[PDB]
Structure 1
């Protein structure tokens, strides 16, 4: 569920910060998705499951 949350927060991260490296940005997004509650990634996980079922 954290993968779709990271994918959805990547544009927010690029808007809040200019971005220096994709690796550090991805690490920070993963750390944030792990520190936040699991309910925050529920619609993201639902959209990921929908995209997996459609493809």
Structure 2
């Protein structure tokens, strides 16, 4: 039911590094170690984003369809 906006590119990268920086930063939270990612992502090589993006896209795409399929439903009336 009502899908939940999958990855957006950054999302991947985030995951990949969070536990690593945090590994060195057991003084941060998934709000600050994450904050860092938030920035680094823009500061990556926009060549290295490409992979994450293709994934994020595929994922949100799925959503947009199943969401549109769960948003534009209960209209035929509807069995």
| TM-score using structure 2 length | 0.51
Q: CA deviation at 1:34?
A: 1.7
Q: How many residues align?
A: 55
Runs of 4+ in structure 1 off by over 4 angstroms are 14-17
Q: Which has the larger radius of gyration?
A: 2
Q: What 5-or-longer segments of structure 1 have no aligned partner?
A: none
Structure 2 unmatched ranges of 5 or more: 1-8, 64-79
Report if the CA contact (8 A) 2:13-2:52 is conserved: yes
**CA-CA distance at 1:10 after TM superposition:** 2.5
RMSD: 2.1
Distance 2:62 2:23 in 1: 30
Aligned-pair distance for 1:41?
0.9
